[PDB]
Amino acid sequence: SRLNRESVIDAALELLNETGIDGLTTRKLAQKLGIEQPTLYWHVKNKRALLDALAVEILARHHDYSLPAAGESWQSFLRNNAMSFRRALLRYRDGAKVHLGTRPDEKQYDTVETQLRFMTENGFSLRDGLYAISAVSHFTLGAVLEQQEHTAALTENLPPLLREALQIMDSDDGEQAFLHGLESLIRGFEVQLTALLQIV
C-alpha cells in the first residue's frame, strides 16, 4: 500500500496496537503494508526509528492539552497537561513504553519551550520548573506503564490489608490513584515554590 511517512506511521500504530511493542518488527510491518522487506527498508531503517516516530505521533494525535489557557494557573496547566498525556499514552497498547527515554522532537520544540517558559513566568527557576515537569511526566508514565503491563500479564493465602488493597487496585482502571497522586505532586511543588528561602 501507500508508503509515505503518514501511512507507514498509521500502519505501525495499527501493528503496535494489535501486537504490542514486541510485535512491532520491521518484518511484521512489511507484511502489514503488503511489501517486501527491502522495500520497507528504503523508508524505515530499523525499529528504533519507528519507535521515535511513534512516540511523536501518539501525542500529535491524542495529546490535546499541550499548552496553558489564557490566564490559566501553573497548577491547573500541570493537572490538565497530565490528564491529557495520560489519555494519549493509554490510547495505544504499550504507548507508554514507546515514549520511554525519548527526547523532545524538533516538531515539539515550540510547544515544550512554551511549557518551560510558562513555569518560569510563574516563579519557578528553569531547574525547579523542569523538576516539576519531569516529576509529572515520570509519575504519569509509571502509573500508565504499571496499568498496561498488568493487563498484559493477565495471561486466599493473602494477608487482610493486601487483599483489600488488591480489590481497591482492581476496582477501577487506575484513574483514581493516578488523580490522587497527581494532586499530591502538584501541592508538593506549590509548598516548595512558595517557601522561597524559608526552611520548609
Q: Binding site for tetracycline: which residues?
A: 63, 81
Written as nine digits, the cell of 73 is: 494557573
With CB under 5 A as the contact rule, the residue among 25, 73, 134, 184 that binds Cl ion is 73
Residue 155 interacts with which of its own copies, Cl ion, ligand TAC, none, CB < 5 to 8 Å by class: its own copies
Written as nine digits, the cell of 68 is: 496553558
Written as nine digits, the cell of 36 is: 517486501
Residue that has been written with the C-alpha cell 516539576 in this structure: 132
Are residues 96 and 145 in contact, defined by beta-carbon separation less than 8 angstroms?
yes
DSSP H helices in 154-174: 160-169
Least Å distance between CB 40 and ligand TAC? 27
Of 55, 48, 58, 51, the closest CA to residue 105 belongs to: 55
Are residues 129 and 88 in contact, defined by beta-carbon separation less than 8 angstroms?
no
With CB under 6 A as the contact rule, the residue among 165, 176, 187, 188 that binds ligand TAC is 165
Written as nine digits, the cell of 175 is: 484513574
Of 59, 45, 135, 132, the closest CA to residue 96 belongs to: 59
Binding of its own copies by 61 (CB under 8 A): no
With CB under 8 A as the contact rule, the residue among 102, 105, 122, 175 that binds its own copies is 102
Binding footprint of ligand TAC on the chain (CB under 6 A): 59, 63, 66, 81, 85, 103-104, 108, 111-112, 115-116, 133, 136-137, 165-166, 169
Binding footprint of its own copies on the chain (CB under 8 A): 48, 97, 100-104, 106, 109-110, 112-113, 116-117, 120, 126-128, 130-132, 134-135, 137-143, 145-153, 155, 157-162, 164-166, 168-169, 176-177, 180-181, 183-189, 191-192
